[PDB]
Amino acid sequence: AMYQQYSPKDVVCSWNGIAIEGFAPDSFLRLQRTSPLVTPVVGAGGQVALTRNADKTGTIEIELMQTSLSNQMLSAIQAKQDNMELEEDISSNFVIYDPSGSVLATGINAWLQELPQIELGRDQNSKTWIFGCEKLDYTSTIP
Amino acid sequence: AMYQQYSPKDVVCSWNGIAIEGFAPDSFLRLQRTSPLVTPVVGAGGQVALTRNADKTGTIEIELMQTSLSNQMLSAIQAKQDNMELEEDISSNFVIYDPSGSVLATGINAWLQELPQIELGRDQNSKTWIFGCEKLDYTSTIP
Amino acid sequence: QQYSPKDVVCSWNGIAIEGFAPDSFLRLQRTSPLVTPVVGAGGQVALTRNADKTGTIEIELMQTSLSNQMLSAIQAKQDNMELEEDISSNFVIYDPSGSVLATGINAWLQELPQIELGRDQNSKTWIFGCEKLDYTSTIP
Amino acid sequence: QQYSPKDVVCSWNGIAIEGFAPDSFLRLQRTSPLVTPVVGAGGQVALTRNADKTGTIEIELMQTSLSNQMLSAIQAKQDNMELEEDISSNFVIYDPSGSVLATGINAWLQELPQIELGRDQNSKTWIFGCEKLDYTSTIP
Amino acid sequence: QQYSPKDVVCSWNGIAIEGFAPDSFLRLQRTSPLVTPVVGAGGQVALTRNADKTGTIEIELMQTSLSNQMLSAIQAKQDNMELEEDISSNFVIYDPSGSVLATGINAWLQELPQIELGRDQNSKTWIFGCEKLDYTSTIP
Amino acid sequence: FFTANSDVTALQGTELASANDVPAQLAKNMYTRTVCLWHHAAAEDYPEMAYIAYGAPYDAGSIAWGNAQLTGVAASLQPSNQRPLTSIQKSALDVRHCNFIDLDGGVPVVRRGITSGGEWIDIVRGVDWLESDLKTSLRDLLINQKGGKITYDDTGITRIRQVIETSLQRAVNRNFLSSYTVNVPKASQVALADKKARILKDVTFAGILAGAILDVDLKGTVAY
Amino acid sequence: MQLETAELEKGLVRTLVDVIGHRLARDKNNRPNVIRAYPSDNSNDKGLKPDQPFITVYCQDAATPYGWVLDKFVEDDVVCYRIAFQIPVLITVNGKGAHSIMLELKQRLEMSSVRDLILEETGATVLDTGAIPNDYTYLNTDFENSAPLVVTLVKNSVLKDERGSIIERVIVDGELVYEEGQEPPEYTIHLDVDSK
Amino acid sequence: MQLETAELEKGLVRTLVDVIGHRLARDKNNRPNVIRAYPSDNSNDKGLKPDQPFITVYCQDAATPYGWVLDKFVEDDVVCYRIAFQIPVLITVNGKGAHSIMLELKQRLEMSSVRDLILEETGATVLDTGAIPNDYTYLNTDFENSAPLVVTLVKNSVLKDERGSIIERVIVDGELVYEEGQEPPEYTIHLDVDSK
């Protein structure tokens, strides 16, 4: 038996109501929790106790092409959010759709964190955007 | 559909009224904000709060050819500014023109920061100049 | 019908191209394979379906063929245009025998021909790129 | 019996394939070797049995062979299907002389053929992958 | 008109060059391609228009051709000049049949010829660079 | 042809056969190139010109005309009591293929944006732009003679295929279409009567529209 | 211009009279002795061997190593074709000192001039020129010195296709559909474009 | 369509009468002189040499460089085979100005037209066309000018296998076993599938 095939063409990301398109040639998405699930502590006598970290935040990094049109939409949205008052909400769920089931996680109350470094040369350099999330859930189909 | 094409030939930079020309073979321009937009803080119980950094400065690095004539103009301008009194202004907007829309940012009240390291050998070594800016704006055409 | 080299017609940018070299006057090739298999340490196999579908089209003409002037003139015009205007055009190839069932969706001129001036008349190679090298079929 | 090139039959996806090129119209090859020996500084030897058993199948056809249309049509259909549905099918080769005793367990089309339009009719090369290239034997 | 190897004329630095080798006595080639495509993971395509337009010009002459002395003498003079003075000059090629429509804007001598003294008279290869290898056309 | 209407009789009835107001007559004749907007103030004012400016600034075929927001144009109101039109009255306009300024939760919007023939505006506008681009490209060959005149063998017909295909691909780039096909007659099968008339027939194509979304339907449940 | 070897031979013969006529013998009309090979007239008459030294011109064959068709274009409503040809020709000198005359003929065909006169008469360009052997054939009594040479030429020929025609009107039909095979099409576009 | 050189030669002969018939001589019936090589009738009668200029058509051989079998299919219940063939043909002009006529014949076989008429008559496509020499053969009394040419053709031939048959019913049997060679099988599956 062989597992399901992976197709980059059928991956769609969305955030704040817009669709993010124009993935870079390679490594166009990354997901990562901040802290580990458990932090063991070992005494001098060899006994062991387990700490269960409550931190569950995460970071989602997405890398787009140099001239992708989605770079303009993100810039406009970020410009809008700089003038909003502190009592208005700026976070929205980050949704990834992937029929191959290779990506398991989704972002709850994600926010834009860093702007992309801009570089120019003979070739084209990808632009990296970084987002945070209050809880980076991991989900899967029931075994 | 395919995005707009990138042409290095049609990129023009200007600062202090002079035009900077003679880009190096590769990686001739870089832009970067100093601090990230948001700095999340997580408590022991998993609750999350967001800090919004007010720092918006940046750095613009431009790399020119070894014998480019623009190296002389920058040296002359820098020599002029060393003798000016502290109450005279030394900052000017850094303007990048790019019809392909790959560069989104511009420098507000930019100043010269570092001189280029000079190296010689069998081949030609590029010279790197570094500028600061009070605010590295990000702008785009309305989606 | 059956293949014959005198029926092949190539059209790009609205013009027709003739004066092909005696042999090997056309070539087509995709850039990447359809599928890239991955094999784990345990022998299991999973498949990756590449989204890449670009390709290259190489066409050879005689040194004195009139089509050389047309392509050089077209290339010269595109060097004096702003980035707003487009340069792509469908590259259409027709062959009654059905030996070459393909067409370039958005084809752009890529490389200028190399020139050699040996004893006898030589050939010139023009290379075009395309966004999607389609392989069609004559059967439903 | 004895080998003759007119008895080889290849079948994939339920269709039959004919119009083979005059020579070198079929090739088989495993990806990895059966065993990878390791030699230490002292001359001792230990063996690693690779779990990899995939392979490649290359088949050449004439440019105007009707089988080219069938494969192009099959490939076109698979580009408009969801990932849930499968694309693999056993590649079966029959030869009465027993020269080629092999079959691809789960074979998938991998690469499209290169096209050349020289003086005379040329060939088209189709490449298939397989999850397990089995080498069978006619002797218990 | 039609191509003939007896009509090609090359001129550089004000002098004329003759005594070409029997075959392959001239070659032209750009350094970089016109366009470098980039394909993302999703299959989208964007084009980069290279600003590079330099080129190389290779010319072969007989070992005893008088033009060899002229080029050596020109090269020797340029070794005893200050950097203020220039060394570039347009390289102009004329051909009535229009097979080679190109010219080097600012051409500089780049490499000295290799020398071999086998049985029969051999050839000498001179290589020139240029700032802009222009490809002209005879059609508006 | 953009026009407004303020006849109160258009708000009554739901059978197109019985209706006799101006919008009803337009829908009866299946006029696909006429757009009618119902608005009480359409007697001395001209709200239509506002609707034209909504989509005119942008390129053809890549814009949906429904759900449009107009600045300064009030919602359609009943002349009798200045109340927004009820659901019954809106349905009366629907069977007449007449637009109106519906109300969201406090935001007026021209909802459907369909012509009197039942065809979406962006379909009509896109077809006209495509039919003008094709004419310009072909006239470059027939009249301007780029690359010389066209011969009546397979060489000339392939050139006609290339120009037509290029224009259709331009439509796909705008997201107006999603695919297409082109068919041309073989040069060895065209009757030798057309060859003397210098006329080429039997050139056809087909396209697949992209589509868009304007409405949504949703259902859900809540439980412990 | 059409390619006909009968005219190429005549042009070469006329050119050689001026180019190398001073070294040859002369007939009763004072014309240098240059002739076409296998002379004959009225379908059975046979020419006599001229007085030495003289020259003979004979076209060997014609080939198309440069593809099959060079250009296809429309010049007037009639369609046209252009084809590239190559024609090797054989020139021989018979007499005494044939090699000494062939050498000078070689050294003149390579000049910037002469190559212009050849193109003025025949409308063809000289492409190559082979080596010259030094032959002796016994005949009867005495040997005869001879010196053949091969000069290849290149020419373009144009012909008129009187069966061709041009397209001056196009009629186009189209349809649009949400889904493939939608029997009643959503929209139909009909177009007609005239040359005028 | 079946491949028969006897028909290819006839089709070429009929086509040439219209293509190049205006340059040739004509017989008592006003027909241009084009004939097949080695004329004969009634197994011993021999044809006479026509009046010049004339043309001769002779098929050299036939080969299958493109594999051995191209297609195998079922058209009606009878099985069918398709095979690709290549046929070089030799056309010669005899008379005066043979080269001048062969050149024009070459320049017409390359047109978009003419190649359609050849396919209309013979149902074959022109693949290549070789060079034209300029030959002279002494015969008796006077030399004869000749100009041969080789035109290669390509055609597909189909034949009917009257001994073949098709499968319209299949009977299948199977077994299942926990271990290899389990003499009493765990389960047996019997299946039968008809075409109808």
mmCIF file of C-alpha atoms in Angstrom, chain F residues 8-114:
data_model
loop_
_atom_site.group_PDB
_atom_site.id
_atom_site.type_symbol
_atom_site.label_atom_id
_atom_site.label_comp_id
_atom_site.label_asym_id
_atom_site.label_seq_id
_atom_site.Cartn_x
_atom_site.Cartn_y
_atom_site.Cartn_z
ATOM 1 C CA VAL F 8 -46.082 52.191 -8.839
ATOM 2 C CA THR F 9 -47.954 49.575 -10.885
ATOM 3 C CA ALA F 10 -44.685 47.639 -11.246
ATOM 4 C CA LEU F 11 -44.879 46.614 -7.572
ATOM 5 C CA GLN F 12 -48.167 44.681 -7.889
ATOM 6 C CA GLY F 13 -48.705 41.193 -9.264
ATOM 7 C CA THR F 14 -46.374 38.264 -9.821
ATOM 8 C CA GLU F 15 -47.319 36.987 -13.312
ATOM 9 C CA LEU F 16 -45.374 38.562 -16.163
ATOM 10 C CA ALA F 17 -48.120 37.782 -18.685
ATOM 11 C CA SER F 18 -50.706 39.926 -16.890
ATOM 12 C CA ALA F 19 -48.403 42.878 -16.177
ATOM 13 C CA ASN F 20 -48.424 45.850 -18.545
ATOM 14 C CA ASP F 21 -46.077 48.404 -16.948
ATOM 15 C CA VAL F 22 -42.923 49.488 -18.772
ATOM 16 C CA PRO F 23 -40.600 47.030 -16.952
ATOM 17 C CA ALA F 24 -43.040 44.192 -17.633
ATOM 18 C CA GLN F 25 -43.119 44.927 -21.365
ATOM 19 C CA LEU F 26 -39.319 45.018 -21.545
ATOM 20 C CA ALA F 27 -39.019 41.567 -19.969
ATOM 21 C CA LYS F 28 -41.682 40.210 -22.330
ATOM 22 C CA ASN F 29 -39.570 41.074 -25.390
ATOM 23 C CA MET F 30 -36.445 39.486 -23.858
ATOM 24 C CA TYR F 31 -34.302 42.604 -24.349
ATOM 25 C CA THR F 32 -30.904 41.606 -22.951
ATOM 26 C CA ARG F 33 -29.165 44.962 -23.554
ATOM 27 C CA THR F 34 -31.476 47.157 -21.442
ATOM 28 C CA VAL F 35 -31.038 47.665 -17.693
ATOM 29 C CA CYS F 36 -33.966 49.041 -15.685
ATOM 30 C CA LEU F 37 -33.717 50.328 -12.108
ATOM 31 C CA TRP F 38 -36.751 51.041 -9.927
ATOM 32 C CA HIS F 39 -36.421 54.117 -7.716
ATOM 33 C CA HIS F 40 -39.028 56.538 -6.395
ATOM 34 C CA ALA F 41 -36.831 59.585 -7.038
ATOM 35 C CA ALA F 42 -36.419 58.635 -10.718
ATOM 36 C CA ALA F 43 -38.930 61.301 -11.803
ATOM 37 C CA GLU F 44 -36.683 64.387 -11.731
ATOM 38 C CA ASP F 45 -33.386 62.794 -10.651
ATOM 39 C CA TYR F 46 -31.192 60.340 -12.575
ATOM 40 C CA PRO F 47 -29.951 57.590 -10.235
ATOM 41 C CA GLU F 48 -28.926 55.459 -13.232
ATOM 42 C CA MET F 49 -25.813 57.530 -13.905
ATOM 43 C CA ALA F 50 -24.620 56.658 -10.398
ATOM 44 C CA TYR F 51 -24.923 52.956 -11.223
ATOM 45 C CA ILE F 52 -22.942 53.429 -14.441
ATOM 46 C CA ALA F 53 -20.045 54.978 -12.515
ATOM 47 C CA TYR F 54 -19.889 51.921 -10.240
ATOM 48 C CA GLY F 55 -18.369 49.650 -12.882
ATOM 49 C CA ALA F 56 -17.286 51.949 -15.699
ATOM 50 C CA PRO F 57 -13.887 52.818 -14.125
ATOM 51 C CA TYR F 58 -12.773 49.173 -14.125
ATOM 52 C CA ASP F 59 -11.892 46.748 -16.896
ATOM 53 C CA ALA F 60 -14.618 44.694 -18.535
ATOM 54 C CA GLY F 61 -15.583 41.170 -17.539
ATOM 55 C CA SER F 62 -13.771 41.036 -14.178
ATOM 56 C CA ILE F 63 -16.382 42.738 -11.965
ATOM 57 C CA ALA F 64 -19.716 41.554 -10.579
ATOM 58 C CA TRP F 65 -22.343 44.298 -10.736
ATOM 59 C CA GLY F 66 -24.528 42.951 -7.933
ATOM 60 C CA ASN F 67 -24.336 44.038 -4.300
ATOM 61 C CA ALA F 68 -23.175 47.475 -5.452
ATOM 62 C CA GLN F 69 -22.870 50.306 -2.934
ATOM 63 C CA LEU F 70 -23.733 53.790 -4.186
ATOM 64 C CA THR F 71 -22.875 56.966 -2.299
ATOM 65 C CA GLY F 72 -25.762 59.344 -1.684
ATOM 66 C CA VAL F 73 -28.462 57.186 -3.293
ATOM 67 C CA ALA F 74 -31.243 56.345 -0.851
ATOM 68 C CA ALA F 75 -33.026 53.004 -0.823
ATOM 69 C CA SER F 76 -36.131 52.551 -2.946
ATOM 70 C CA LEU F 77 -39.220 53.711 -1.054
ATOM 71 C CA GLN F 78 -42.953 53.409 -1.532
ATOM 72 C CA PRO F 79 -44.329 56.793 -2.672
ATOM 73 C CA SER F 80 -47.391 56.457 -0.439
ATOM 74 C CA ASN F 81 -45.700 56.265 2.976
ATOM 75 C CA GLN F 82 -41.919 56.536 2.397
ATOM 76 C CA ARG F 83 -41.291 53.030 3.730
ATOM 77 C CA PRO F 84 -38.735 50.639 2.211
ATOM 78 C CA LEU F 85 -40.330 48.220 -0.222
ATOM 79 C CA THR F 86 -41.686 45.050 1.355
ATOM 80 C CA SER F 87 -40.783 41.478 0.464
ATOM 81 C CA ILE F 88 -43.900 41.092 -1.690
ATOM 82 C CA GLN F 89 -43.062 44.175 -3.745
ATOM 83 C CA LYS F 90 -39.467 43.027 -4.224
ATOM 84 C CA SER F 91 -40.696 39.700 -5.602
ATOM 85 C CA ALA F 92 -42.876 41.626 -8.052
ATOM 86 C CA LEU F 93 -39.755 43.323 -9.407
ATOM 87 C CA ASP F 94 -37.906 39.994 -9.554
ATOM 88 C CA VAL F 95 -40.368 38.470 -12.025
ATOM 89 C CA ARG F 96 -40.021 41.657 -14.095
ATOM 90 C CA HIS F 97 -36.202 41.415 -14.085
ATOM 91 C CA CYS F 98 -35.989 44.926 -12.633
ATOM 92 C CA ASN F 99 -33.240 46.026 -10.272
ATOM 93 C CA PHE F 100 -33.829 47.800 -6.971
ATOM 94 C CA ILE F 101 -31.891 49.200 -4.012
ATOM 95 C CA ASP F 102 -32.483 46.586 -1.335
ATOM 96 C CA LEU F 103 -31.523 47.095 2.311
ATOM 97 C CA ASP F 104 -29.017 45.157 4.358
ATOM 98 C CA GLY F 105 -28.912 45.987 8.055
ATOM 99 C CA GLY F 106 -28.750 49.728 7.399
ATOM 100 C CA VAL F 107 -26.744 49.676 4.141
ATOM 101 C CA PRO F 108 -28.461 50.181 0.755
ATOM 102 C CA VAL F 109 -27.256 47.938 -2.069
ATOM 103 C CA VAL F 110 -28.292 47.316 -5.674
ATOM 104 C CA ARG F 111 -28.652 43.570 -5.345
ATOM 105 C CA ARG F 112 -29.073 41.631 -8.577
ATOM 106 C CA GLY F 113 -27.775 43.818 -11.403
ATOM 107 C CA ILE F 114 -29.330 41.706 -14.165
#
